[PDB]
């Protein structure tokens, strides 16, 4: 069994060896590998060990996606334990189901890109917040379809990931522009639609994202511009922030008051683009309900 | 069945021409004008245990008369007739002529789930009846016979109900709606002899020790009757106007 | 909300005739989400009906239940324990006495905790006792008999309080008893008071 | 039984005539009882009036004092409110705020102190830091230390309270003084010019003054003896 | 046959399709004293509905289910007849009479539907006493798992939304809100509650007294002054008489007004409701479906005169007291059910998974 050093080292190595890998995917793979090497025979003990490893996996890379992946993994093992009832029989089936689950979630970026690239028109002006690989893949798919468009991206001041995405997008010969986080209200009137990533989809259909997303959502609503969000299926989490203060503090801080995360209400979101398809925000809760019945 | 009708009757008292009809006819007519397909009648037997013979000449649909012994009281009659009692009882008296809508009483028995409902006539020895502000629930019942010198009220009664309205001229019509467990308690205790004289005051006193409630309907503009000869003459005078619509 | 899922529910049967010699906890198949949070100790599931789920890796379980809380999972069976394990290196006498049966001063020595002499604790601490799935009922029945309450979490809290009280009564530097393994602590205490008298 | 006696009567000169006829009468209750029992001769009946939307009550003891003070602060005797200044004077002017907080001129509240509700502060009062005053009336010119707690207490003119005091449901008369770290249990009374020494917890019925016999405990610059 | 209750007074033109009765006039004036057409339990329940002795939605549903259990206990199947549909045919006039006494609520409608489905499901081979016992046990289990356990789950769920030192605004009287607040105070949370009331029922005094007896600090004011206290209010916790398939919340008259004013002040809105009050029907306003109470309840004595004393003498004067109103789904943030905390737009989803 892993001893809090093999687990963290495995997580960091998984992230480092594949820099194009989501944090939640790396966490799920680490949990599956931990389940492979257990050397114990009890479903209760396995659940306890997994849920205890969740905290030490969330100690580093405290993003919401890791917690969502851990909750999804716990629900997965509970679902398997319902069906079989012998830890010995259930172990192999959980291992194989985790293998298929990893293979399925590895294609989420491609599915989202294929489903979403049709919403970008010729001559459109996309507005993006920060660096996200899903939006990058969507724009790559749009370019592969011979569409021509412009892109504005904010600098994301706390860590200049906006410039990183601008570089990664100029690498594809896409005409892009970099704007300040305070220039969003100046730029919204030029853009035709807004595409942002998500670090987690909350129960009501809102999103949890980098600190500058709420301003862009509010400005787009004021200017009546569509606001599209791309997020993977494993980012669904049963949390309901009543407001900005209500989101748990373990997601705001640790990568005078510099939160790293804010919450966007579902009323400001037009459509969610997931590997499950194109959804209204109200759909998300439905899915997140069907999992827990 | 919701109610069982019991008529008290213990020339005799029940046979008394009032508008060419006997005294006992009016309560029976009142009962059978509002449902009451069947009625239990207790027959007096002090003069003779054969009054049911000429009772059976009445034109009412169903009559169940039973002879009695030489002497017996109202509660004693009730504990005699228990074996045929199955639900809430509606105890009446033969000497009662009135035109009140009976629902006005039984509604108080229905809506509030009362343990006792009674009827009284407004004015027109004494009995002191204290009711609440709404004039429906009665909180105090007394007579000067057992009232030594002064009317006495418990502090907690006024604590719960800080306004008590007192009446002295009220006339008891002896029309009672009673729960079954009241009869059962009467069965467990043979001390009580008369309903109006001992049972009802006991129930009123037991209101303020799952709990029991007692309600009274005080009618203000209608008819009432009693045993007295002057009351008999008044009933004879009023029946001519009363019997026109009945 | 995954914290409320259970696999087996402990039904509690308390005997008024003999709360110590009788009364038992029986585990039944319960594969559904519970109404309350769940704690896991030695593969045993405790419904946190009277207590609340806690987080962190602080030692001294006394500080978990001093706040009205209880950890999600702790003990030797947990790979990542939240009690900062310690050994209580005195169970050699417990292993030696495990082969001893019930048959003066030793009688009152074994009287604690139940008030009646018993050798069940040595069977608990015996080396040939794997803390598997088949032993949950027996360990939980021992815990339930020990305490005086209808709630299993309150039974755990009362058990640890009794252990701490006896440790301070005999003067064993109570810091060396954090409730990491209640049965190891109680076996050490019973054997030590047997040796003393 | 639901009638509160406001002790207000509309009388006739016949009332004074009856009082001087029966020279032994001493109270209004005596007059009412003697008149109601003597009804067969000199009828002289008494009537009554009931009010429902108006307020009236007389202060007879400390219980009535506290109840009426709470009612007055909570505007139950409108328009006779503290901010109305119905006795026009420069000293007794104040402003009304949320949760029935009445603040006079130059109150100078400290940092971190919280006024919960139903608090009246007199002119020239000084409040320390991290205080907690609730449901209390504080007279003008009072001086209050730091980290104090006042709950349903009344302080008259010149009251000085040291830091760390805990005062609940007690009355402090003119120029009373409380030393460091003193706790006053409910139903406590400190009369004028009374000091209480440090490190003492007065019981739940303490009444102390400078007059030995009438006071339950003779008071001085000390707490015990 | 049961006579038709007569409308009292003149109705508003926009509400001409709704009945409007008087509290003093009852149907039992034209009914036999020993109840024959309808069961005595049903006539008692109708009298205590019309007079207002049972008001709460949960209380009304519980009373109706107890009366139905009493009816089922005394039911005797006729010869050459089957219980499954004879019992439903017998129950239909009882429902009509109860609707005559006072219009049914959503909880009563759902209970009636559930009981009809249960009765229809009774097999023909079942023997009478076993069928009656099964129906009584089903009614008891429904009451338990749809009121008591649901309230416990909702109270547990709402404990996480209540923090220390926050202000909660409640409206009217509802057992669920009072239970949630009392349990939250018992667990250790410290907070204030603001009670908002409205004429003529003035039923906020019930929850005010409950909170005072529980020890929770409380404030009291009428609905028009609500816009004065919302600046200091942190959350608005409401109870719902029904959740509609479009997410709209049907409740007491001032609920949607309070939601709108709270939205104007940027205050989150939570609505607590049990999943058995969810309705498949939809309505976009309070006009198409509502209940008209006794207009004479609007009369109040201000000073020494009642301005609306002889209001029927004026030919062109009408009185209007609604009982319910509809809150649009965009004014509600949470719906707290025994299933958890859900968005206001997930009402049909629950309706899909409960059938």
Curated annotation (Swiss-Prot), chain A:
Which gene carries the instructions for this protein? EIF2B1
User: Any known activators or inhibitors?
Assistant: Activated by the chemical integrated stress response (ISR) inhibitor ISRIB which stimulates guanine nucleotide exchange factor activity for both phosphorylated and unphosphorylated eIF2.
Give the modified residues of type N6-acetyllysine.
Answer: 36
Q: Which residues form a coiled coil?
A: none
Q: Alphabetically, which GO biological process terms does the record hold?
A: cytoplasmic translational initiation; oligodendrocyte development; response to glucose; response to heat; response to peptide hormone; T cell receptor signaling pathway; translational initiation
Similarity-based family: Belongs to the eIF-2B alpha/beta/delta subunits family.
InterPro entries on file: eIF2B_alpha/beta/delta (IPR051501), elF-2B_alpha_N (IPR042528), IF-2B-related (IPR000649), IF_2B-like_C (IPR042529), NagB/RpiA_transferase-like (IPR037171)
**Known role:** Acts as a component of the translation initiation factor 2B (eIF2B) complex, which catalyzes the exchange of GDP for GTP on eukaryotic initiation factor 2 (eIF2) gamma subunit. Its guanine nucleotide exchange factor activity is repressed when bound to eIF2 complex phosphorylated on the alpha subunit, thereby limiting the amount of methionyl-initiator methionine tRNA available to the ribosome and consequently global translation is repressed.
**Entry protein name:** Translation initiation factor eIF2B subunit alpha
- Pfam families noted in UniProt: IF-2B
Keywords (alphabetical) are: Acetylation, Cytoplasm, Disease variant, Initiation factor, Leukodystrophy, Protein biosynthesis
Disulphide bond pairs = none
State the compartments where it is located: Cytoplasm, Cytosol
Is Hydrolase one of the keywords?
Answer: no
Organism source for this protein?
A: Homo sapiens (Human)
Q: What is its main location?
A: cytoplasm
Curated annotation (Swiss-Prot), chain B:
Phosphoserine carried by residues: 211
How might one describe the regulation of this protein's activity?
A: Activated by the chemical integrated stress response (ISR) inhibitor ISRIB which stimulates guanine nucleotide exchange factor activity for both phosphorylated and unphosphorylated eIF2.
Q: What's a single GO CC term here?
A: cytosol
Q: In its UniProt record, which GO terms are filed under biological process? A: cytoplasmic translational initiation; oligodendrocyte development; response to glucose; response to heat; response to peptide hormone; T cell receptor signaling pathway; translational initiation
| Alphabetical UniProt keywords | Acetylation, Cytoplasm, Disease variant, Initiation factor, Leukodystrophy, Phosphoprotein, Protein biosynthesis
* UniProt similarity note: Belongs to the eIF-2B gamma/epsilon subunits family.
Disorder = Leukoencephalopathy with vanishing white matter 3: An autosomal recessive brain disease characterized by neurological features including progressive cerebellar ataxia, spasticity, and cognitive deficits. Brain imaging shows abnormal white matter that vanishes over time and is replaced by cerebrospinal fluid. Disease severity ranges from fatal infantile forms to adult forms without neurological deterioration. The disease is progressive with, in most individuals, additional episodes of rapid deterioration following febrile infections or minor head trauma.
The protein's name: Translation initiation factor eIF2B subunit gamma
Supply the source organism for this entry. Homo sapiens (Human)
UniProtKB/Swiss-Prot annotation, chain C:
Q: What is the protein named?
A: Non-structural protein NS-S
The gene name reads NSS
The protein's organism comes out as Sandfly fever sicilian virus (SFS)
The entry sums up its family as follows:
Belongs to the phlebovirus NS-S protein family.
Q: What start-end ranges are recorded for coiled-coil regions in this protein?
A: none
Entry superkingdom: Viruses
UniProtKB/Swiss-Prot annotation, chain D:
Which segment of the chain is annotated as a signal peptide?
Answer: none
From the Swiss-Prot or TrEMBL record, state where the protein is found: Cytoplasm, Cytosol
Bias kind Acidic residues: ranges: 215-225
Give the sites modified to Phosphothreonine: 81
Write down which residues bear the modification named Phosphoserine.
209, 225
What is the protein's quaternary organization?
Answer: Component of the translation initiation factor 2B (eIF2B) complex which is a heterodecamer of two sets of five different subunits: alpha, beta, gamma, delta and epsilon. Subunits alpha, beta and delta comprise a regulatory subcomplex and subunits epsilon and gamma comprise a catalytic subcomplex. Within the complex, the hexameric regulatory complex resides at the center, with the two heterodimeric catalytic subcomplexes bound on opposite sides.
Disease implicated: Leukoencephalopathy with vanishing white matter 5: An autosomal recessive brain disease characterized by neurological features including progressive cerebellar ataxia, spasticity, and cognitive deficits. Brain imaging shows abnormal white matter that vanishes over time and is replaced by cerebrospinal fluid. Disease severity ranges from fatal infantile forms to adult forms without neurological deterioration. The disease is progressive with, in most individuals, additional episodes of rapid deterioration following febrile infections or minor head trauma.
Family from the record:
Belongs to the eIF-2B gamma/epsilon subunits family.
Q: Provide the protein name.
A: Translation initiation factor eIF2B subunit epsilon
Species for this entry: Homo sapiens (Human)
Q: Which gene encodes it?
A: EIF2B5
Residues of the whole record sequence present: 242 to 466 of 721
